[PDB]
Structure 1
Amino acid sequence: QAFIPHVYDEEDNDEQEYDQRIQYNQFQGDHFDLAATRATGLNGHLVLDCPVADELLSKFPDYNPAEKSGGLSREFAFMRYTAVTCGPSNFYRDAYILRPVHYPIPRQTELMIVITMYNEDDILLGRTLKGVFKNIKYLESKARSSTWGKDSWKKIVVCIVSDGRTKINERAQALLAGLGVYQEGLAKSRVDDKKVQAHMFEYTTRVGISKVTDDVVKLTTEKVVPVQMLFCLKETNAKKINSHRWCFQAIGQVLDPKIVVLLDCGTQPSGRSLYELWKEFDRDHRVAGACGEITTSLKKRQMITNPLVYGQNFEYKISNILDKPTESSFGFISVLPGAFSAYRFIALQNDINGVGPLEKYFKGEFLHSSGELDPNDDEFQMKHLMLKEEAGIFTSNMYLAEDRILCFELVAKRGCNWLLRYCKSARAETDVPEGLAEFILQRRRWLNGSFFAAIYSLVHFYKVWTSSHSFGRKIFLHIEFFYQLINLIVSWFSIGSYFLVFRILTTSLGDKALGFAPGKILSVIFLWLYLASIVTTFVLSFGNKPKGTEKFYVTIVIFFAILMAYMIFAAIFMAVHSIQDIYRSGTRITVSLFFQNSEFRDLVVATSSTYALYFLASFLYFEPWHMFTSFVQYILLSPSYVNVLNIYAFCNIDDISWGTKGEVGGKSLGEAKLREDGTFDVSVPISKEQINQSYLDQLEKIRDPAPPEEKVLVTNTEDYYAFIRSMTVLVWMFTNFVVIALVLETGGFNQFVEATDLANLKSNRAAVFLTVILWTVAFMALFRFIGCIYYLITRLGREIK
């Protein structure tokens, strides 16, 4: 029973109210001309208007048995199929017409909701579609709105760009077919001896997903608002940047929408999230990009059984509570999550000269690939011209930044005034990777992107000077740039700092002054295990794949968790001993004396202050639970975050997806067939003249000496990226080691000090380093706390107005 009566859950009371506000009796479509086995394709393109299944029409309320058509409008009766051969670059240049703009009265799009899909299960697509449909129903129900209200569904288009014709999951395809967008027969591989790049299906579906259980998806036609669906199935997978090219460069130009919303399969927006994003864009005309709070689902996951899920939950909550508000207050957000964000279409458009955010974003796809262009592609000229252009370090490595480049390119425009804003009213829920390998692979992409984006923005900070912002705005943008520079410096030396803190804390327990016997043996054992884990992580990152050697990573993570617990114990013990010593001294006890004590101060005051700031920020946002349920897991996993993820990310900076190539010869000399008789039919030279001529040709060929040939080939790009990655890790290793040598004198530096002065000189440097690092962390926390408080105050003030 695919179709079941509509049922509202406990949380669907708002949906019920929306339904009460909507009439549900005036879903009348606009008449449009159809396309006529011989078919009259429009403008020389293959276009087919096929009829939808009779059962699906019979489900619709407007269906009437008496009328053969059923009384339904043309758009509700026929689904349109178009075969696209040109590709994104020339889609607008060719006369490719989408149905929304083909009506006698053109429809102007107000909100384009892009969904990216790749071999995703039907459950994830069902959840995303249910969220989008609920949002559209809410927008329709809205009464006292200038832009929204009756017939609001005509201004909204849902675009699903599936990457990979043969990689799409069968069940998701079945679901889309059940909605009526897709039919199996229509697909065509080639048209007029030209490859079909993408298959586009268009239909205004009136089928709504009633519920999405864990295993099955139920669809019902009762109380469903029509939704314009565009399903663009790509013939071959070209990653996500190519899908975004299809969305922006090709479909966006034809539709010319406002406020393009980007979604990802499995991300379920709230009931009013899209309205909140639209309102954010509408209130302030300067806003060019926006993002919403992203949450992690914890439905059937236990606190103890899934430490990783809760660690990620805490990370997401802290990010949304501290980082995004501060950057939004400054007006420049480092990263807008690709799972849920929104952009204003006009802001992204390139300049007359051809330079703009979209050009920078797309260049990464072209440059980061094998230099093998098929001459038959119609985009051959564009790709050849792009490859012939002189590319520097930054241009040729844009693929690391990905969408992150867009944020900076928007803020620091030549003569434009744009800002990026974060709204906490918009919420979306997603499933985080439970397994360790997927987490490692996912964070590998985030870390590389963040590092490259930070470097690129910092190096090009001067571009904001020419932007038409207020002078105070530029001053505060420079303050934020300085903060990001400090954050980058702190993140670059994370592994060295972690090792230094661990070594100092463990060796401090070895001192005979405090009464801890196993200090020394434990410190030595932990040092050996630490070095072994680091070396194994490097070797596995360079050599093997995470999926295969997962148990090694699990063991390393467990060891680092135990080591973190031991480090916390050592710090507490060290502080207690220091406090006890002051009382044992016999001196007067004052508040200045506690602050004067470097050990107690650094170890306790800084960490407690950071925890208090996190706690207060969590409470002020009415989101306190993560500070209890998921704090411990995050604390215990932090060293793994710094060591394993960072090492794996840097070791694989190059993402070499393409493989080796081979011309593989195959001259078609010929074949020998066998007749009924034993004789074989062959074709070999017979005439003596031909044989003698061939022999003389061979003699003349071998008579002359071999001319020199100097290989001056451009070579392949995989070597270039392998080289870039190798240099980065080497510089990363060298700089970290220099810092470690200075602080601990591990290298030859101990040769310059005396044996009696070695013990006294190592201690002072360690204390200075500990205080510096801890107070740097604390001050960054305070900075973000002030940021978030300002964001709350200003948002409340704007709401009041």
Structure 2
Amino acid sequence: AFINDEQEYDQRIQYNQFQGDHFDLAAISTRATGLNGHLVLDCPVADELLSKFPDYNPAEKSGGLSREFAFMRYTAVTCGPSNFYRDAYILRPVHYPIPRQTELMIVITMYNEDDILLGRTLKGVFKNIKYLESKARSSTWGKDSWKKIVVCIVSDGRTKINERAQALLAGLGVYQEGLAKSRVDDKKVQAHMFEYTTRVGISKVTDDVVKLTTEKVVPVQMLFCLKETNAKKINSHRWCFQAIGQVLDPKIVVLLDCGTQPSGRSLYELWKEFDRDHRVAGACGEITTSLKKRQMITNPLVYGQNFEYKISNILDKPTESSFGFISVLPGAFSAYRFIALQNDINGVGPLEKYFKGEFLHSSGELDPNDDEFQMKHLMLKEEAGIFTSNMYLAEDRILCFELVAKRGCNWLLRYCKSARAETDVPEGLAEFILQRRRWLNGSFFAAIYSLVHFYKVWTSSHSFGRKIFLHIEFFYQLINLIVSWFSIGSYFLVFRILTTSLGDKALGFAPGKILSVIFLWLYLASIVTTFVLSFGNKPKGTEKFYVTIVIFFAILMAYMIFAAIFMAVHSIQDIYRSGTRITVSLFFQNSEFRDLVVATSSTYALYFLASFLYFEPWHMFTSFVQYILLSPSYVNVLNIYAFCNIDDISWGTKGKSLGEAKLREDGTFDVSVPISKEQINQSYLDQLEKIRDPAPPEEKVLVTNTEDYYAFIRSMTVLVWMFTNFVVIALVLETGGFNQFVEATDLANLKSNRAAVFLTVILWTVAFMALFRFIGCIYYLITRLGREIK
């Protein structure tokens, strides 16, 4: 088990002086005393782990190590997040005789993750801490910087945690099996907290095994909170913020996910972003997809995702940062300023909005024995509107808006490209669909919520010009939402127009008509099957259907590209053949050539230039084709699955022995049955009286279950979506009954004109959005360079 930039850090660190601070222990005789009447145990760590440490001396009983390095602390938390601070629950960092002030709380979220992912994340975090320690000419960082950093690992579900990751944590010395206790004082233990200052560092993380060593390892404070039962990720974040954060009172809480490996200096970059400008309340960093042992052709999906991530980080994030409002801060890698998230005295704030989703989106079955029964009952008893009861879709996204549009605060969200983190994307199609479900639902709901409540920014204490530019950004987001809502209909219309144009006898393409008919039938069949499967079955089961649909859509996209190129070439040849003193004006006056070629070429050129200016050009070559061929799948399959499954009904449905006859030694059975005549007569009379009366009306008027409400919401949403898309399609191609209001010959020309108008509208909308994002990213680069010079 035990065996260039990194090297630099090691030279600056002395590594000889790492004596820990003394703290009071808990007596463990096996009666054990608990601090403040809580179950707390300071157990000794395995002697081998102590022996590994350089400072260890065989003669000394504990090796001469400090109290913190010698003993690991275990606490049983029964109250839960809401009352954790109210009760006298004390964490070790704040229990020292000299209080320690936290500067950076690195939260890590875990759920049945392999030990490899956790090892990678911990290696990244340890490298960042080592870099911070090595920093010499820093006012805040340097010697004894590890005391200001706490790493919190919140594992969701005691029985769902992977055994190998748990073994990894045990190897670090944080966790021990015997300590954990199910109940204390007849009270269920909601969480188990293990605290230890580990001096064990992961040397390397191969594909199959993890190697940890004690050589050149900086001590790290580790708090491992294992939850008794799984309550999703919102509950984990409630533990992180509502309970642990209040006790620690940190700054710049960093949120990480297992499998996300930050760079060697990424966390320093995030901290510096927060430090330079005091108005910044949230920050995000570049997220990359690993392509180590994945081929270009064998894994089209991975490379398509790589292209999507690169384009996002190059165009979307910089523009939103320039405007000061970022729609989404990735939960896998982000950072928030703790004070900015605090609620107001009235009790309304970003954290309240974020947490309300968990309580509202759940079965209305509250256990009376829970100590948070009063809070949950009061929240559920409150009248909730559409937005409040559907907050669960937005998730972290809501926070961003609530931070920017505060009542009287001046907060901004910023994106830094210096911070980089690498994560593993889902290779399988089913996992990819499942991941995109919640991403799409959250994006849509957050956009709708922000646009509806755009007026809340009026009262915020921002400069007038800042408000004007925020309104410009809101207008852009409204246009983007409108475009995204009509994506499926626009795709179908473009496909139909391009395929039917090849059927025209003017151009010399014989199979065009038959191919168009066949493709139409296949397209309809694929859409219908996608809807049926999205409602009926699970993606993991019927994966082959989705694979076939994706392949067909890729082939169709290739055919559409070929058709567009053929049409443009034919239009140019028609420009030439006749002979009209050919000039650039005529080329730009031809609707076909202009719309089909110029707009798409301009969009591609803008993407190419944006990639080049950021010194990240490879993705434009290696991964462009895969993304282009998968685009229709993104619009059709993922969107249909997401909208069909807006409701996430995780909870199931709903939720005195008469006697016991035991055979005795003899054949007789011991029974207790009525014997006296009096009781038999009384029971008979009671039955007579029970049936002797008419039936009263039920009039239950029960509240009923919330699953029906969410299912109704989802059904209404999908129906409205279908209706609007079909209205647009019928208006463009004269598909419904509209054809009756025209004649045999007028219909063709009218349909052609409408199709041309629609094509030019959609293509130029896309091109102008691309230009807007390009200008945004150029401004981001210029301002960041100027700031760096300053």
Normalising by structure 2, we get a TM-score of: 1.00
- Write the distance in 2 (CA, Å) between the matches of 1:68 and 1:139: 33
> What's the CA shift string for 1:514-571, capped at 9, x where partnerless?
0000000000000000000000000000000000000000000000000000000000
Query: Does residue 139 of the first structure (1) align with residue 132 of the second (2)?
Result: yes
> What's the CA shift string for 1:453-498, capped at 9, x where partnerless?
0000000000000000000000000000000000000000000000
> What's the CA shift string for 1:736-783, capped at 9, x where partnerless?
000000000100000000111111100000000000000000000000
Q: Please, which of 8, 15, 20 is the counterpart of residue 17 of structure 1?
A: 8
30-39 or 599-608, larger mean C-alpha shift = 30-39
Query: Could you say what secondary structure the match of 2:283 adopts?
Result: strand
State the partner residue of 1:389: 382
Please state how far the C-alpha of 1:676 moved relative to its aligned partner.
Answer: 1.6
> What's the CA shift string for 1:416-454, capped at 9, x where partnerless?
000000000000000000000000000001000000000
- Write the distance in 1 (CA, Å) between the matches of 2:698 and 2:443: 45
Query: Could you say what secondary structure the match of 1:88 adopts?
Result: coil
Query: Could you say what secondary structure the match of 1:758 adopts?
Result: helix
State the partner residue of 2:142: 149
Please state how far the C-alpha of 1:380 moved relative to its aligned partner.
Answer: 0.1
> What's the CA shift string for 1:562-621, capped at 9, x where partnerless?
000000000000000000001112111100100000000000000000000000000000
Please state how far the C-alpha of 1:21 moved relative to its aligned partner.
Answer: 0.5
- Write the distance in 2 (CA, Å) between the matches of 1:153 and 1:756: 80
When the two chains are superposed, the root-mean-square deviation of aligned CA atoms in Å is 0.6
- Write the distance in 2 (CA, Å) between the matches of 1:379 and 1:785: 50
State the partner residue of 1:634: 627
State the partner residue of 2:156: 163
State the partner residue of 1:771: 760
State the partner residue of 2:462: 469
- Write the distance in 2 (CA, Å) between the matches of 1:59 and 1:69: 12
Q: Which structure 1 residue ranges, 5 or more long, are not aligned?
A: 5-12
State the partner residue of 2:704: 715
Count of aligned pairs between the two proteins:
788
> What's the CA shift string for 1:315-352, capped at 9, x where partnerless?
00000000000000000000000000000000000000
For the 8 Å contact 2:571–2:592, the answer to whether it is kept is yes
Query: Could you say what secondary structure the match of 1:673 adopts?
Result: strand
Please state how far the C-alpha of 1:710 moved relative to its aligned partner.
Answer: 1.6
Q: For residues 231-380 of structure 1, what are the structure 2 equivalents within 5 Å?
A: 231-380=224-373
> What's the CA shift string for 1:366-423, capped at 9, x where partnerless?
0000000000000000000000000000000000000000000000000000000000
Please state how far the C-alpha of 1:730 moved relative to its aligned partner.
Answer: 0.1
- Write the distance in 2 (CA, Å) between the matches of 1:340 and 1:17: 25
Please state how far the C-alpha of 1:711 moved relative to its aligned partner.
Answer: 2.8
Query: Does residue 694 of the first structure (1) align with residue 687 of the second (2)?
Result: no
Query: Could you say what secondary structure the match of 1:677 adopts?
Result: coil
- Write the distance in 2 (CA, Å) between the matches of 1:797 and 1:48: 54
> What's the CA shift string for 1:233-254, capped at 9, x where partnerless?
0000000000000000000000
State the partner residue of 1:456: 449
Query: Could you say what secondary structure the match of 1:755 adopts?
Result: coil
State the partner residue of 2:741: 752
> What's the CA shift string for 1:90-127, capped at 9, x where partnerless?
00000000000000000000000000000000000000
For the 8 Å contact 2:286–2:417, the answer to whether it is kept is yes
> What's the CA shift string for 1:664-712, capped at 9, x where partnerless?
xx92211100012111000000000000001011111111111111230
- Write the distance in 1 (CA, Å) between the matches of 2:694 and 2:521: 62
700-709 or 320-329, larger mean C-alpha shift = 700-709
State the partner residue of 1:10: none
> What's the CA shift string for 1:12-68, capped at 9, x where partnerless?
x11111000000001010001111111110110000000000000000011100111
- Write the distance in 2 (CA, Å) between the matches of 1:706 and 1:62: 84
For the 8 Å contact 2:94–2:248, the answer to whether it is kept is yes
For the 8 Å contact 2:50–2:62, the answer to whether it is kept is no
Q: Which structure 2 residue ranges, 5 or more long, are not aligned?
A: none
Please state how far the C-alpha of 1:795 moved relative to its aligned partner.
Answer: 0.2
Query: Does residue 26 of the first structure (1) align with residue 17 of the second (2)?
Result: yes
Please state how far the C-alpha of 1:793 moved relative to its aligned partner.
Answer: 0.1
- Write the distance in 1 (CA, Å) between the matches of 2:136 and 2:254: 23
- Write the distance in 2 (CA, Å) between the matches of 1:711 and 1:151: 66
Query: Could you say what secondary structure the match of 1:482 adopts?
Result: helix
Q: For residues 78-97 of structure 1, what are the structure 2 equivalents within 5 Å?
A: 78-97=71-90
> What's the CA shift string for 1:628-649, capped at 9, x where partnerless?
0000000000000000000000
- Write the distance in 2 (CA, Å) between the matches of 1:476 and 1:587: 47
Q: Please, which of 176, 179, 195 is the counterpart of residue 186 of structure 1?
A: 179
For the 8 Å contact 2:488–2:635, the answer to whether it is kept is yes
Query: Could you say what secondary structure the match of 1:468 adopts?
Result: coil
- Write the distance in 2 (CA, Å) between the matches of 1:621 and 1:586: 45
Query: Could you say what secondary structure the match of 2:224 adopts?
Result: strand
Q: For residues 640-655 of structure 1, what are the structure 2 equivalents within 5 Å?
A: 640-655=633-648
> What's the CA shift string for 1:157-193, capped at 9, x where partnerless?
0000000000000000000000000000000000000
480-489 or 675-684, larger mean C-alpha shift = 675-684
- Write the distance in 1 (CA, Å) between the matches of 2:178 and 2:33: 18
- Write the distance in 2 (CA, Å) between the matches of 1:726 and 1:85: 40
For the 8 Å contact 2:251–2:338, the answer to whether it is kept is yes
703-712 or 110-119, larger mean C-alpha shift = 703-712
> What's the CA shift string for 1:283-342, capped at 9, x where partnerless?
000000000000000010000000000000000000000000000000000000000000
Please state how far the C-alpha of 1:69 moved relative to its aligned partner.
Answer: 1.9
- Write the distance in 2 (CA, Å) between the matches of 1:545 and 1:49: 47
For the 8 Å contact 2:109–2:258, the answer to whether it is kept is yes
510-519 or 34-43, larger mean C-alpha shift = 34-43
